[PDB]
Amino acid sequence: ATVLLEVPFSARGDRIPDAVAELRTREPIRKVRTITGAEAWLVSSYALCTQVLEDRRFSMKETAAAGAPRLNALTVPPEVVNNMGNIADAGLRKAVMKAITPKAPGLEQFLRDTANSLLDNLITEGAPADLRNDFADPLATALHCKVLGIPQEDGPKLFRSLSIAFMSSADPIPAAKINWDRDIEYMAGILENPNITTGLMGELSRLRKDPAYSHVSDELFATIGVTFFGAGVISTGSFLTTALISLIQRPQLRNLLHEKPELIPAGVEELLRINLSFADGLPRLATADIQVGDVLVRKGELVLVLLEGANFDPEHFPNPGSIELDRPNPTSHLAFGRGQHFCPGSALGRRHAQIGIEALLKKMPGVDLAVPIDQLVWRTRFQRRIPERLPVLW
């Protein structure tokens, strides 16, 4: 006898397990057990993943309900699971989007200058260089301090909450509450700081004193700063790091993008499509009995939308494991989700990766791993798949 199939399958972000294609072909919706011991429905085909993400009766908000089957323990207060919904209800959605667009004056130049300075420092120090700790993550942190309008010197401390805040744990994490409360106090101070007049926090500070937003809570304003810094920095730093591995493992593509940097945006879209940065399926709780393929999902059950299940589906993306720059449906992947909860930082994440890759290929055209690929150490029980260090030479 064997136990019910457990998720996640592997923390490695450099290869997709053969099990994904097996489940997609044989049982594209099937029962699994999560790290908490709960049962869930794992969805692995493009058609069924899109159906779940486009039906709001599969609720993100309701995954925080007490007594629900859980993918993992909350690392934020339960109301914060519905963060975007709370922002929209407060009439702040348009202002938040305008603040996080990569089109802001001087933002792209700031990204280029920061990426170039980090790379120059690595070249001065000499090989090996760690592209996660000394490139991708500081570039993501610097970008988010600029987008938020907060001091660059405050970035490293806010960043150090992330290795705990984005854990995917069976049980509550005491350190996550200590760091959450401290980071909220910091953002509350930023709202009261007269020097903070630019970026997302400068805009929220002004809207907070506008009569049209007098009843929006101070708790929500501080929460927007903590959540957008954390989600943006963990997502951009982790995606860029794993996209750099995908590129280093494809020297023909690396050489083509070095030669023709105008192809970098199409290259980043394929790197997003094949990305294995999300460690778990996206969770949703059914609020009704809903038919998904051969399964009638019952009200109160947990559904997990496996992004790599959809993104590597050959019925939607033929030769799914290959980076092809001329696909006819290039942005139809689910790397940023789909539907009600589609990533609000999609344009900024694309620009962060495009500029980081453009700068790296110009400065280090001979970039290569400095250790055999199996020697990368993959972070476990985390909401993202990332190597602890990414040692390279050039």
* Interface contacts to ligand 1GB, rule CB under 6 A: 75-76, 81, 83, 165-166, 227, 230-231, 235
Residue 162 beta carbon to ligand HEM: minimum distance, rounded to whole angstroms: 13
Residue 333 beta carbon to ligand 1GB: minimum distance, rounded to whole angstroms: 17
Q: Is 232 exposed, middle or buried (0-12, 13-18, 19+ CB in 10 A)?
A: buried
Which of ligand HEM, ligand 1GB, none binds 236 (CB below 5-8 Å, type-dependent)? ligand HEM
> CB of 392 within 8 A of CB of 370?
yes
152 is in an annotated binding site: no
Pairwise CA distance, residues 4 & 70, whole Å: 16
Which of ligand HEM, ligand 1GB, none binds 239 (CB below 5-8 Å, type-dependent)? ligand HEM
Residue 228 beta carbon to ligand 1GB: minimum distance, rounded to whole angstroms: 7
Pairwise CA distance, residues 283 & 300, whole Å: 12
Pairing of strands 295-297, 290-292: antiparallel
Which of ligand 1GB, ligand HEM, none binds 76 (CB below 5-8 Å, type-dependent)? ligand 1GB
Q: Which is nearer to ligand 1GB, 254 or 352 (CB)?
A: 352
Residue 330 beta carbon to ligand 1GB: minimum distance, rounded to whole angstroms: 23
Q: Which is nearer to ligand HEM, 129 or 231 (CB)?
A: 231
Pairwise CA distance, residues 83 & 197, whole Å: 23
Which residue type sits at 19? Answer: A
Which of ligand 1GB, ligand HEM, none binds 100 (CB below 5-8 Å, type-dependent)? ligand HEM
Q: Which is nearer to ligand 1GB, 184 or 371 (CB)?
A: 184
Q: Which is nearer to ligand 1GB, 327 or 333 (CB)?
A: 333
**Cα dist. 114→20, 27, 104, 138, 153 in Å?**
38, 46, 16, 9, 14
Residue 337 beta carbon to ligand HEM: minimum distance, rounded to whole angstroms: 3
364 is in an annotated binding site: no
- Residue 7 tokens, joined: 């998720």
Pairing of strands 282-286, 129-130: unpaired
**Cα dist. 354→16, 73, 77, 102 in Å?**
23, 34, 34, 11
Binding site for ligand HEM (CB under 6 A): 60, 84, 100, 227-228, 231-232, 235-236, 239, 277, 282, 335-337, 341, 343-345, 348-349
Q: Which is nearer to ligand 1GB, 50 or 75 (CB)?
A: 75
Which of ligand HEM, ligand 1GB, none binds 349 (CB below 5-8 Å, type-dependent)? ligand HEM
Residue 343 beta carbon to ligand HEM: minimum distance, rounded to whole angstroms: 3
What are the DSSP E strand ranges found in the chain? 29-33, 39-43, 58-59, 129-130, 282-286, 290-292, 295-297, 302-305, 368-369, 391-393
